[PDB]
Amino acid sequence: HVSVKPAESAAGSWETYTMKVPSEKNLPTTKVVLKMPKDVEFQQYEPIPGWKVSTQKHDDKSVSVTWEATDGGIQEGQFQQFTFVAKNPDKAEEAAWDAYQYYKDGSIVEWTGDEDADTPHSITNITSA
């Protein structure tokens, strides 16, 4: 399950987020794509050995960040944490973190479901007062 923490954060602020990506298969995780939640503006990423990081704007105005393994990826029995900075929206909202976990066999696990789904996205509660 991919998580982006903190699970609560203040509206309007520049938050340092940490995405944790555990292995869930006995195969390497070679790439992770994270969609920015609505109204959350990506600012910067923290470099990490063994990964190249890039951002993608899209035809719809959403933005994604991609971490691609340049070494062995995340192996069985491992997890990795990836840190970045984003600006929170101005109003209270539930920010969903749609993540796509790529494995070496070409499979993609889509951490995009709601509460009851098999692969839910994690959420940050953007609050105020």
Numbering used by the authors: 27 to 155
Give the original sentences from the paper that presented this experimental model.
The ycn operon comprises genes encoding three proteins: the putative copper importer YcnJ, the copper-dependent transcriptional repressor YcnK, and the uncharacterized Domain of Unknown Function 1775 (DUF1775) containing YcnI. The B. subtilis YcnI protein contains a predicted signal sequence N-terminal to the DUF1775 domain, suggesting that endogenously, the DUF1775 domain is localized extracellularly and tethered to the membrane by the C-terminal transmembrane helix. We crystallized both the apo and copper-bound forms of the protein and determined their structures to a resolution of 2.05 and 2.11 Å, respectively. Overall, BsYcnIΔC adopts a cupredoxin fold featuring the characteristic Greek key β barrel shared among many bacterial copper-binding proteins.
The fold of the apo structure of BsYcnIΔC is very similar to that of the Cu-bound protein with an RMSD of 0.59 Å over 127 Cα. The primary differences are in the N-terminal region near the Cu-binding site. Instead of the His27 and Glu50 side chains turning in toward one another as they do in the Cu-bound form, in the apo form, these residues are oriented away from one another with the N terminus directly hydrogen bonding to the side chain of Glu50. In one of the two chains of the asymmetric unit, we observe two alternate conformations for His27, suggesting that this side chain displays a degree of flexibility. In our apo structure, we also observe a malonate molecule from the cryoprotectant solution near the N terminus, indicating that this region of the protein is solvent accessible.
